[PDB]
Amino acid sequence: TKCTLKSFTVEKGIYQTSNFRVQPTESIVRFPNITNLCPFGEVFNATRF
Amino acid sequence: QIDRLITGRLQSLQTYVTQQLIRAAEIRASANLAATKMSECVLGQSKRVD
Amino acid sequence: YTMSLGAENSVAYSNNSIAIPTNFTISVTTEILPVSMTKTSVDCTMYICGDSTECSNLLLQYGSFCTQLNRALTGIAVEQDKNTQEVFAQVKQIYKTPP
């Protein structure tokens, strides 16, 4: 309340404040199931080049 | 850079002026009430309750 | 159409003729008045920059627009409470009808 009002002294009453209290945030990455694989198997391991 | 500053400061001035206009409308209503109160309360005797 | 203002009615005026009622009616009408709004409050930081640190840092450059908007809305809500208080809370005590 003190900083959100930009003062060191606070009068009587119910003030609405900001949100300075930060929290550490992890990261997540999500993608669909790996499907649809190329013919690389028959291209690298081909019988004859 | 000065255009950015000018836009910001002009917005601040416009906000201040609009707030002043609204507060002046409020004060105009209060002054009309006070004038009516002086007319019907000091210069006379109102039978209007409360 | 050209709207009609009302029903034409000439008054039977005369220098020695008066019209006095012989009966009456007790009419109850209804008058509706608004007294308060919904005490809306906006979280300006979350509205402009919802859960974004970089946006919040950029918004902090614009000074105290956000603060004064919040202050104006708080004033609105307090004013609505005061309006309801002044309209209704005009009786010092709480009377109750006898059985």
Next chain:
Amino acid sequence: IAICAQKFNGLTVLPPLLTDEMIAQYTSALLAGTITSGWTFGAGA
């Protein structure tokens, strides 16, 4: 349902200080005063 403060984009509706029951009680007091005393209850006792 049975946190709506963060579900919307930061917009909340604060409740009024006087609940509808309190407003009803106030109107009840005013109505009883008017019925049982007239205008005297406004001027004084």
Next chain:
Amino acid sequence: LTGTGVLTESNKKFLPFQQFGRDIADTTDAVRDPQTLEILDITPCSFGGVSVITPGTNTSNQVAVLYQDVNCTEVPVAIHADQLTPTWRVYSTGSNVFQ
């Protein structure tokens, strides 16, 4: 899509071909997990609906905190009390907890 928020078990019934939820302000509200066919509601992780009731600092430095429209069991999860200063965890649980 990318964003920041808290993922919670949802109650909605997405259609088989719909992927991303959306609110009226073109903002992501729920998502379908690409691997698991489960719908997760995205509730932003920020609380600005916090009011601090204080007598004048001249008189005392004891204060009370009002969290807007929450239950008293959801408070240490709404404001993430586990990742807060221990002096804020005073005002998230305890014995003086009215609703």
